[PDB]
Amino acid sequence: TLLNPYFGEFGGMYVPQILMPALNQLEEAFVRAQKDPEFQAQFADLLKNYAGRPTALTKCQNITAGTRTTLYLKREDLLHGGAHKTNQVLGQALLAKRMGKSEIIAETGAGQHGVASALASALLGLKCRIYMGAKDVERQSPNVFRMRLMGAEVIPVHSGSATLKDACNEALRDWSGSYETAHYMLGTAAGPHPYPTIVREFQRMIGEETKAQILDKEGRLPDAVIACVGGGSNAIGMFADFINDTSVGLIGVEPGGHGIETGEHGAPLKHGRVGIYFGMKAPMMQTADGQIEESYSISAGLDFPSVGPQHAYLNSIGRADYVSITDDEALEAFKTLCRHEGIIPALESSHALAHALKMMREQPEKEQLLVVNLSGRGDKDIFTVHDIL
Amino acid sequence: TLLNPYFGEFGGMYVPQILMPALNQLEEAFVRAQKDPEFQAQFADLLKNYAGRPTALTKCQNITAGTRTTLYLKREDLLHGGAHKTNQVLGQALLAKRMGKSEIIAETGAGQHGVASALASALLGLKCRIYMGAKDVERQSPNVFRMRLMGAEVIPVHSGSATLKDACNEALRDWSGSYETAHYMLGTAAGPHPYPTIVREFQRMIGEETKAQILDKEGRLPDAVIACVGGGSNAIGMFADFINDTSVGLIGVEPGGHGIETGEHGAPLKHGRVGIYFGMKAPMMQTADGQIEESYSISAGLDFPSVGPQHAYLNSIGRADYVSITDDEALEAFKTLCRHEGIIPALESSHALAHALKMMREQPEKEQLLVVNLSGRGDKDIFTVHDIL
Amino acid sequence: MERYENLFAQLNDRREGAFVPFVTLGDPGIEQSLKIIDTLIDAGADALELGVPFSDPLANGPTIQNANLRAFAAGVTPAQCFEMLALIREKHPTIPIGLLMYANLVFNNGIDAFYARCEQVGVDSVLVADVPVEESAPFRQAALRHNIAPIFICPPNADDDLLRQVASYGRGYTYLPLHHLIEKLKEYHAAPALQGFGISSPEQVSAAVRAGAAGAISGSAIVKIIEKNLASPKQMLAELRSFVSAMKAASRA
Amino acid sequence: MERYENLFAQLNDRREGAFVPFVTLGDPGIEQSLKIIDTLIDAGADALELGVPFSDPLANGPTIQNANLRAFAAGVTPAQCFEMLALIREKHPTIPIGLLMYANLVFNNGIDAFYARCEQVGVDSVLVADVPVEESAPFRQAALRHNIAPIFICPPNADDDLLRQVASYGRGYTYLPLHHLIEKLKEYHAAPALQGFGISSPEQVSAAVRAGAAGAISGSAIVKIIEKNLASPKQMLAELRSFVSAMKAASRA
Ligand SMILES: Cc1ncc(COP(=O)(O)O)c(CN[C@@H](CO)C(=O)O)c1O
Ligand SMILES: Cc1ncc(COP(=O)(O)O)c(CN[C@@H](CO)C(=O)O)c1O
Ligand SMILES: O=P(O)(O)OCCCc1c[nH]c2ccccc12
Ligand SMILES: O=P(O)(O)OCCCc1c[nH]c2ccccc12
Ligand SMILES: [K+]
Ligand SMILES: [K+]
């Protein structure tokens, strides 16, 4: 390969031999594209004039009133589509085109990636077919209809547990024979190389923007940047530009679900065991036998049973720290943001906010400049929250 | 008054004497605020860092392929909240604060204004109470819950036909006694002076931005700017900066509903009679007797039975032209945008797009630079459209 | 116009104030409404305030709003209201008849034509609830040339500049510290003031008269009785009679 | 390892190719599965390809996916699969036994330990479906020191650089223009090739052997028969017997 497929011991390209050429082709395309002024110019044009970048960095005073905490929220919820997924999905679509590919294959848990994949494809004239877990089809019907309205062919998977992991399974199955004309648009910074690297690079503008915006408004780097972690794309996008800034803390928040001890969670990085699946070596939810399980969370977007390899590595070396937040904690953060700032965050993003609220509340006299990555809007979550209350 | 309450013969301040001081106070506050560098600085800060301005101006190539039409869409759907309503709602909230008022009263048809009113109030620490038409409460339940999540007190109106016009009635009733401490946040560029003027000025950034963006990308002004017209705020916001640019056409699109001839429409400006209500003299939906009727449309946001006085005036002098678009036409435009550009527009905005599509299709060899005001996103409309298909 | 002149002169000779009840025309039905009005007059009403059902009662509270609904349920229309007005005048030659209107029904098909119809049926005054002093020009002008008295509301938040306008523009009666407004109006020679701040008890009428007002208007209290005895029209009348006699007794005593 | 050596030598003396059926261990139940395997062997199978049920069959089609579901429905676990493997070996001393595995079940609790268990139960080869030549180092090393043959897939999109690696790394057999790959493998002295491109008919077996392959592997076709006779276990066996005999007959003739 042109680039290192590993982040320490994590990563690799654990796919059937038949798929290696596809991975190698994609890596070469990415490397050439990254050196191409014109690829970058078009990517940037789409991000600005189509997706709406740069996103705002909102200082939230009402929520931190009475504490020494200054909180800023990176507004990815304002991005076209309502979530950060659009960023990388646009870059990957341009990559597919660079390779002369006219078709796109994608997978989804929460319909956000499929919707983002469907929108990008509609925009760039690509034939898109999405793989959704049969269960998630009925759970995320609005997202399903949206995908259809944008012309993508939605395909439910009834295999295994009929969820994200099995969907990711079907998409790969397809790609194994169609790689020649179709591009598999992976939805997070996980999977086999070069996906973890590609997704990070196509999401890094989140962190680069946050840096410029915080320097402009505060004249200094934040003490810490916090983001939820499902597969790891929104978090790594925020983290990327701050990795070499040693003074900046990088905090990833995994779903604690009903509580780590209950076993009903989706926090493999801190509460799972390293295994090999999804084409990579990374920590994951699995039985003592080695059978892979599902990640539980109130938020569907954080149901990936594994985590991006770069996150597992940044953790191992102590560069980034990972914590977990319970459904009830996220729900509370969700309610608090709506009432105090007039912003409805996605339940996913609410886990990041929930942690920042904990950092503030536990030590109210600690002076800290925090940035929470608001990865998406929670309009999609009003019903769920309403069913709980 | 400090300013002219009339746009030709349209406008005025047709409210009970008891409410005149409130109107006069508001006008003075607005005039002082408009001359205040600090009011403008804070308004601008909120618009940029909180709402996400400036919004993008997307050139849509796929939809105009094969015609001499170049279409750009002003992305108000990307604004915090998902619609243009947030702009003026933020300015009015700052105005209320300028007057030392701590409470807000608002009205709604489609829950968008109430939601925008609730978000602004939550942000600026204002006690907000919303008036929604009893029927609309059940129709726009998601918007209702959102208002509640943001702490606003939602109040359904069972009077009259239990819709927007009756809601506007209840809000006024309240204000008549509470004007001293509460500000009535009108949701459109209609009603008694100074509201039509205030709402326009607090929405004019849409047009000012469009102008700079079109000059930057095209090096010339557009041949025409098109926007839907319910009460008239999004349209006047777009029109405002182009009024003195005589070469730029201003096209307003009213809902034709099931067809003008069926009587089931909401196009009073071109198919109604001038009357006096909502505190103003303007064309409206009314019986031969003078009893006011409701405006019908597939989109709830275009159900205001009257129109802003400045629109009626711009029409009378031939500066702006108003046309209508049927439910089926809007629905088609809705479908076309999703499939060809990966953007889900609000059914309201779809009426504006539908007309621009007609201008293109009817004369495909006519060279024209058009700008459609995409006033809001259609996520809220996926179900409705899905019920039709 | 002049019917007010005569009434107020008479009342003064008798050293008593005017009690004026308000009701919605056609509530709860044309026939029952006509009977309600005759009962009000028979029970002691010195003048009448009559509203025509409008789709959007911009300045009407619950009680009155419901009156409009009942009226509309009976299919009452402004044309039907004018027919009722002519009949009421034919039966009672001297009671001042005042209309409580909304701007659109007056403006609908000509402001001047509306005032012509009023003069034709024998109406004495017209109060357009949603037309403030600042927008009254065409209404007061059309009213005056048709011998109709333009009635204006002197609100609690009224400055001296408003008091002067109300005094100069109004005729028949002025719809009303309280003594301040009353005395300032008299100073400016405004039409006799009739207090209208939720008057529902006999003590409220004497209080208004003692304060220097020429009388008091009662609306909700009247309609309330109707809403209560909707199922017993005869008891409605009996209760209305008792209320009005009680209120009128309070104006002289 | 060596069981493959002997089989291929024997087959060559007989001038015939190897027919190798694939089945999921414990599908549709442990007992029925053990019987299916004995029937395959009795009907003519030269070697066996056995898969252990994995939660996420990354490289498995519908037929096989359903096999995993049935196996899991019967509660089959890898530990149970190793117990089955020991029993199968105890009954049949010479048939080469190959495992079709997924990386996680091998890596789960030690790659080396997995290969130790394989050697202990009498397994001959292990093909880790999701471990490409580029990630095989630890797997092939652990396999070799436990006398297990590391099996590699030579895909259709294989370049010369891949052919050389497969030839150098693989042992026992190579999982396979076609003649080009076959002859290049032989040129590089790769382990005897066994074709695996959806082989479901007798003509496909002779074709593979005629092309220069040492044999053919049949999976879906085998499992298909099981899925069909799920309600008639005895008929399942009878049909399996007929199929295998037909396929084997095609390798010699
Ligand atoms: C707003 C938002 N923020 C965070 C995430 C979690 O993933 P990330 O860690 O890759 O950023 C999601 C994921 N959503 C997944 C569901 O598994 C998808 O297929 O779309 C999201 O929708
Ligand atoms: C996206 C969008 N675009 C256009 C309009 C129509 O009004 P406008 O003409 O004032 O801009 C609406 C109105 N919506 C009204 C419903 O009557 C409200 O109370 O919220 C909107 O939601
Ligand atoms: O209900 P009450 O007793 O306060 O009546 C008040 C009388 C006249 C009245 C009836 N309806 C109105 C609408 C607007 C302005 C005044 C009125
Ligand atoms: O179904 P068939 O006939 O094509 O079988 C092919 C045989 C071995 C086989 C069974 N399951 C697999 C999973 C991955 C790679 C190879 C296999
Ligand atoms: K995860
Ligand atoms: K309208």
Side-chain angles (χ1 to χ4, degrees):
Chain A
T1 56
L2 285 330
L3 314 170
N4 189 347
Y6 283 90
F7 298 90
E9 62 255 59
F10 313 102
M13 303 169 87
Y14 296 87
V15 302
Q17 197 71 51
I18 195 170
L19 285 177
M20 289 296 309
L23 292 183
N24 287 324
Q25 177 193 24
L26 178 62
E27 184 199 41
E28 126 248 276
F30 173 72
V31 178
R32 56 179 177 175
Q34 292 306 92
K35 295 144 58 69
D36 190 355
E38 264 314 306
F39 175 95
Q40 303 305 321
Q42 205 41 227
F43 187 27
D45 178 75
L46 288 174
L47 292 170
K48 186 178 202 71
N49 307 305
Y50 178 79
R53 300 211 72 90
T55 54
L57 181 70
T58 313
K59 180 173 64 183
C60 293
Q61 294 171 291
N62 295 343
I63 53 188
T64 67
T67 77
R68 288 269 67 242
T69 297
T70 296
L71 180 65
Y72 276 88
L73 300 188
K74 183 56 184 175
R75 310 296 303 282
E76 293 303 296
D77 60 302
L78 297 180
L79 195 69
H80 172 65
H84 72 291
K85 301 207 175 304
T86 302
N87 297 324
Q88 74 108 193
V89 120
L90 287 173
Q92 276 201 68
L94 289 186
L95 218 48
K97 296 176 75 72
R98 164 173 287 253
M99 299 190 286
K101 301 199 187 305
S102 51
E103 304 172 1
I104 295 292
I105 310 176
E107 85 295 337
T108 10
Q112 232 307 101
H113 178 56
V115 168
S117 294
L119 73 85
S121 300
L123 180 69
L124 302 178
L126 295 167
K127 288 167 284 182
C128 179
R129 52 179 173 291
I130 308 296
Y131 282 101
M132 183 99 122
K135 293 183 66 183
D136 289 308
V137 177
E138 290 193 310
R139 321 305 170 188
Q140 271 66 235
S141 186
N143 276 140
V144 180
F145 184 53
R146 279 184 280 251
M147 288 178 232
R148 197 200 86 202
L149 279 173
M150 295 185 279
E153 184 194 340
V154 178
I155 315 171
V157 180
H158 300 91
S159 307
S161 44
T163 48
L164 176 55
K165 69 175 181 63
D166 312 289
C168 304
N169 186 91
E170 261 300 318
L172 283 180
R173 298 190 61 262
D174 194 318
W175 201 34
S176 289
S178 51
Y179 57 96
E180 315 95 344
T181 54
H183 168 68
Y184 174 39
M185 207 179 273
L186 208 315
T188 192
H193 181 248
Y195 290 106
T197 297
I198 292 180
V199 176
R200 175 189 77 230
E201 293 304 297
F202 289 168
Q203 285 287 6
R204 70 176 303 121
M205 66 286 298
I206 296 177
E208 296 172 343
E209 282 180 14
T210 300
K211 170 175 289 176
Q213 297 169 310
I214 198 70
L215 283 179
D216 166 58
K217 306 178 175 71
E218 296 290 337
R220 61 169 299 224
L221 272 26
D223 290 307
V225 298
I226 317 155
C228 63
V229 174
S233 63
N234 93 82
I236 208 67
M238 175 59 85
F239 294 175
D241 211 52
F242 296 110
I243 290 175
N244 289 343
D245 300 300
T246 55
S247 63
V248 188
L250 311 171
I251 302 171
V253 185
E254 301 193 282
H258 294 138
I260 297 305
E261 67 291 328
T262 73
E264 300 175 290
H265 58 91
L269 179 33
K270 284 304 242 281
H271 306 281
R273 182 174 72 263
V274 183
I276 294 179
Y277 187 50
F278 300 109
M280 59 174 188
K281 176 177 292 179
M284 41 185 64
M285 306 269 77
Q286 54 172 320
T287 59
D289 274 2
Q291 301 291 359
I292 303 146
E293 311 167 300
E294 304 170 86
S295 298
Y296 167 77
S297 179
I298 184 178
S299 56
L302 303 179
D303 274 39
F304 182 46
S306 192
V307 290
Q310 191 172 4
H311 283 297
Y313 172 72
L314 288 174
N315 176 51
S316 75
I317 62 175
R319 180 56 189 95
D321 291 291
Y322 301 78
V323 296
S324 62
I325 282 288
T326 297
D327 290 347
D328 290 345
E329 296 182 308
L331 227 23
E332 182 273 314
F334 180 101
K335 297 185 62 179
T336 295
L337 195 64
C338 294
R339 256 293 297 150
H340 293 279
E341 303 295 341
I343 299 167
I344 299 183
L347 276 174
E348 289 83 13
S349 320
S350 298
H351 283 77
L353 179 60
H355 183 71
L357 294 181
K358 192 183 291 189
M359 289 166 69
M360 175 186 75
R361 300 173 179 159
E362 291 188 347
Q363 314 186 128
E365 313 308 306
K366 184 187 186 304
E367 186 182 355
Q368 53 194 158
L369 215 205
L370 311 173
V371 178
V372 161
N373 195 22
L374 215 293
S375 59
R377 46 182 164 89
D379 286 277
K380 60 192 173 65
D381 300 308
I382 57 178
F383 296 141
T384 296
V385 178
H386 199 8
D387 286 350
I388 308 289
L389 53 99
Chain B
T1 56
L2 285 330
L3 314 170
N4 189 347
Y6 283 90
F7 298 90
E9 62 255 59
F10 313 102
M13 303 169 87
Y14 296 87
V15 302
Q17 197 71 51
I18 195 170
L19 285 177
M20 289 296 309
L23 292 183
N24 287 324
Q25 177 193 24
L26 178 62
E27 184 199 41
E28 126 248 276
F30 173 72
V31 178
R32 56 179 177 175
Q34 292 306 92
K35 295 144 58 69
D36 190 355
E38 264 314 306
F39 175 95
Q40 303 305 321
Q42 205 41 227
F43 187 27
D45 178 75
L46 288 174
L47 292 170
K48 186 178 202 71
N49 307 305
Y50 178 79
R53 300 211 72 90
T55 54
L57 181 70
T58 313
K59 180 173 64 183
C60 293
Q61 294 171 291
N62 295 343
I63 53 188
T64 67
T67 77
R68 288 269 67 242
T69 297
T70 296
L71 180 65
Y72 276 88
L73 300 188
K74 183 56 184 175
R75 310 296 303 282
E76 293 303 296
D77 60 302
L78 297 180
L79 195 69
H80 172 65
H84 72 291
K85 301 207 175 304
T86 302
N87 297 324
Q88 74 108 193
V89 120
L90 287 173
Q92 276 201 68
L94 289 186
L95 218 48
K97 296 176 75 72
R98 164 173 287 253
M99 299 190 286
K101 301 199 187 305
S102 51
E103 304 172 1
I104 295 292
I105 310 176
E107 85 295 337
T108 10
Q112 232 307 101
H113 178 56
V115 168
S117 294
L119 73 85
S121 300
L123 180 69
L124 302 178
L126 295 167
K127 288 167 284 182
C128 179
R129 52 179 173 291
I130 308 296
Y131 282 101
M132 183 99 122
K135 293 183 66 183
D136 289 308
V137 177
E138 290 193 310
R139 321 305 170 188
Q140 271 66 235
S141 186
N143 276 140
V144 180
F145 184 53
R146 279 184 280 251
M147 288 178 232
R148 197 200 86 202
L149 279 173
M150 295 185 279
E153 184 194 340
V154 178
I155 315 171
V157 180
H158 300 91
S159 307
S161 44
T163 48
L164 176 55
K165 69 175 181 63
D166 312 289
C168 304
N169 186 91
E170 261 299 318
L172 283 180
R173 298 190 61 262
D174 194 318
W175 201 34
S176 289
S178 51
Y179 57 96
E180 315 95 344
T181 54
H183 168 68
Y184 174 39
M185 207 179 273
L186 208 315
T188 192
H193 181 248
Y195 290 106
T197 297
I198 292 180
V199 176
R200 175 189 77 230
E201 293 304 297
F202 289 168
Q203 285 287 6
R204 70 176 303 121
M205 66 286 298
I206 296 177
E208 296 172 343
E209 282 180 14
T210 300
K211 170 175 289 176
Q213 297 169 310
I214 198 70
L215 283 179
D216 166 58
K217 306 178 175 71
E218 296 290 337
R220 61 169 299 224
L221 272 26
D223 290 307
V225 298
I226 317 155
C228 63
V229 174
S233 63
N234 93 82
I236 208 67
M238 175 59 85
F239 294 175
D241 211 52
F242 296 110
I243 290 175
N244 289 343
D245 300 300
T246 55
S247 63
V248 188
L250 311 171
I251 302 171
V253 185
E254 301 193 282
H258 294 138
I260 297 305
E261 67 291 328
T262 73
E264 300 175 290
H265 58 91
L269 179 33
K270 284 304 242 281
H271 306 281
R273 182 174 72 263
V274 183
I276 294 179
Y277 187 50
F278 300 109
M280 59 174 188
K281 176 177 292 179
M284 41 185 64
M285 306 269 77
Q286 54 172 320
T287 59
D289 274 2
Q291 301 291 359
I292 303 146
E293 311 167 300
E294 304 170 86
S295 298
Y296 167 77
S297 179
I298 184 178
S299 56
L302 303 179
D303 274 39
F304 182 46
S306 192
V307 290
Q310 191 172 4
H311 283 297
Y313 172 72
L314 288 174
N315 176 51
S316 75
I317 62 175
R319 180 56 189 95
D321 291 291
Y322 301 78
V323 296
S324 62
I325 282 288
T326 297
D327 290 347
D328 290 345
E329 296 182 308
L331 227 23
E332 182 273 314
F334 180 101
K335 297 185 62 179
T336 295
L337 195 64
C338 294
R339 256 293 297 150
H340 293 279
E341 303 295 341
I343 299 167
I344 299 183
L347 276 174
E348 289 83 13
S349 320
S350 298
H351 283 77
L353 179 60
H355 183 71
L357 294 181
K358 192 183 291 189
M359 289 166 69
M360 175 186 75
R361 300 173 179 159
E362 291 188 347
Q363 314 186 128
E365 313 308 306
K366 184 187 186 304
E367 186 182 355
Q368 53 194 158
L369 215 205
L370 311 173
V371 178
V372 161
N373 195 22
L374 215 293
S375 59
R377 46 182 164 89
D379 286 277
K380 60 192 173 65
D381 300 308
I382 57 178
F383 296 141
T384 296
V385 178
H386 199 8
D387 286 350
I388 308 289
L389 53 99
Chain C
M1 190 60 242
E2 241 53 278
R3 288 197 178 86
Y4 281 106
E5 172 192 89
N6 306 335
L7 172 71
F8 286 126
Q10 264 88 265
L11 288 172
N12 195 54
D13 302 345
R14 280 108 272 221
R15 293 173 299 282
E16 55 180 58
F19 174 55
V20 179
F22 166 86
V23 74
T24 297
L25 255 13
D27 172 27
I30 298 300
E31 326 92 83
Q32 189 61 216
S33 190
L34 289 168
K35 301 179 185 180
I36 290 165
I37 294 168
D38 277 355
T39 294
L40 299 178
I41 295 176
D42 182 60
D46 296 299
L48 263 27
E49 271 304 302
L50 279 13
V52 321
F54 179 47
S55 60
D56 304 290
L58 211 287
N60 276 125
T63 320
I64 304 183
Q65 288 182 43
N66 295 139
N68 273 34
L69 262 61
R70 294 196 300 282
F72 279 138
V76 174
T77 60
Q80 283 180 176
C81 293
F82 270 100
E83 290 170 10
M84 289 179 77
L85 285 170
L87 304 181
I88 296 164
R89 174 56 72 212
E90 277 189 274
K91 296 186 295 192
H92 315 273
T94 54
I95 18 73
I97 306 299
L99 256 47
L100 204 302
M101 298 298 305
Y102 275 89
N104 201 59
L105 297 174
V106 178
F107 176 88
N108 184 54
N109 286 123
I111 293 176
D112 193 81
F114 181 80
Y115 288 96
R117 254 268 79 166
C118 286
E119 181 180 28
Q120 184 177 354
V121 299
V123 163
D124 295 299
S125 72
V126 173
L127 193 171
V128 194
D130 52 350
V131 173
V133 166
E134 294 85 350
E135 299 282 10
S136 64
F139 300 81
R140 65 186 199 252
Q141 290 159 1
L144 291 177
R145 52 186 188 260
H146 293 274
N147 303 294
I148 303 299
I151 309 303
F152 293 102
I153 290 182
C154 187
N157 57 7
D159 49 41
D160 203 66
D161 311 275
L162 172 55
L163 289 173
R164 296 185 189 266
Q165 288 186 281
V166 173
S168 297
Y169 301 172
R171 304 289 178 248
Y173 79 90
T174 305
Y175 192 108
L176 191 60
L178 190 66
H179 84 98
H180 175 264
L181 302 171
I182 295 183
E183 269 58 82
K184 264 299 183 180
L185 288 164
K186 296 185 168 182
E187 182 183 322
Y188 301 143
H189 313 316
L194 294 180
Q195 220 251 44
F197 303 151
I199 310 293
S200 298
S201 65
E203 193 160 54
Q204 284 177 284
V205 184
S206 56
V209 175
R210 190 189 319 127
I217 294 171
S218 178
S220 295
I222 303 288
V223 193
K224 154 212 303 169
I225 296 179
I226 294 179
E227 302 194 356
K228 194 174 72 65
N229 299 86
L230 237 290
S232 308
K234 263 43 194 169
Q235 250 312 107
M236 187 190 300
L237 274 27
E239 295 205 8
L240 277 166
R241 185 161 285 105
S242 295
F243 181 71
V244 176
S245 68
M247 296 296 267
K248 179 54 206 173
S251 63
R252 46 173 58 101
Chain D
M1 190 60 242
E2 241 53 278
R3 288 197 178 86
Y4 281 106
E5 172 192 89
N6 306 335
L7 172 71
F8 286 126
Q10 264 88 265
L11 288 172
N12 195 54
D13 302 345
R14 280 108 272 221
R15 293 173 299 282
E16 55 180 58
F19 174 55
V20 179
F22 166 86
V23 74
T24 297
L25 255 13
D27 172 27
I30 298 300
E31 326 92 83
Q32 189 61 216
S33 190
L34 289 168
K35 301 179 185 180
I36 290 165
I37 294 168
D38 277 355
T39 294
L40 299 178
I41 295 176
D42 182 60
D46 296 299
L48 263 27
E49 271 304 302
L50 279 13
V52 321
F54 179 47
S55 60
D56 304 290
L58 211 287
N60 276 125
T63 320
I64 304 183
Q65 288 182 43
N66 295 139
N68 273 34
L69 262 61
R70 294 196 300 282
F72 279 138
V76 174
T77 60
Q80 283 180 176
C81 293
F82 270 100
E83 290 170 10
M84 289 179 77
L85 285 170
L87 304 181
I88 296 164
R89 174 56 72 212
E90 277 189 274
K91 296 186 295 192
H92 315 273
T94 54
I95 18 73
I97 306 299
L99 256 47
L100 204 302
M101 298 298 305
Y102 275 89
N104 201 59
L105 297 174
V106 178
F107 176 88
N108 184 54
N109 286 123
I111 293 176
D112 193 81
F114 181 80
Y115 288 96
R117 254 268 79 166
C118 286
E119 181 180 28
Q120 184 177 354
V121 299
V123 163
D124 295 299
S125 72
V126 173
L127 193 171
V128 194
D130 52 350
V131 173
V133 166
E134 294 85 350
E135 299 282 10
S136 64
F139 300 81
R140 65 186 199 252
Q141 290 159 1
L144 291 177
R145 52 186 188 260
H146 293 274
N147 303 294
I148 303 299
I151 309 303
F152 293 102
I153 290 182
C154 187
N157 57 7
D159 49 41
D160 203 66
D161 311 275
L162 172 55
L163 289 173
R164 296 185 189 266
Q165 288 186 281
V166 173
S168 297
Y169 301 172
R171 304 289 178 248
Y173 79 90
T174 305
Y175 192 108
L176 191 60
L178 190 66
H179 84 98
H180 175 264
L181 302 171
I182 295 183
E183 269 58 82
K184 264 299 183 180
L185 288 164
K186 296 185 168 182
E187 182 183 322
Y188 301 143
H189 313 316
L194 294 180
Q195 220 251 44
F197 303 151
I199 310 293
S200 298
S201 65
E203 193 160 54
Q204 284 177 284
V205 184
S206 56
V209 175
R210 190 189 319 127
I217 294 171
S218 178
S220 295
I222 303 288
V223 193
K224 154 212 303 169
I225 296 179
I226 294 179
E227 302 194 356
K228 194 174 72 65
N229 299 86
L230 237 290
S232 308
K234 263 43 194 169
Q235 250 312 107
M236 187 190 300
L237 274 27
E239 295 205 8
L240 277 166
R241 185 161 285 105
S242 295
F243 181 71
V244 176
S245 68
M247 296 296 267
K248 179 54 206 173
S251 63
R252 46 173 58 101

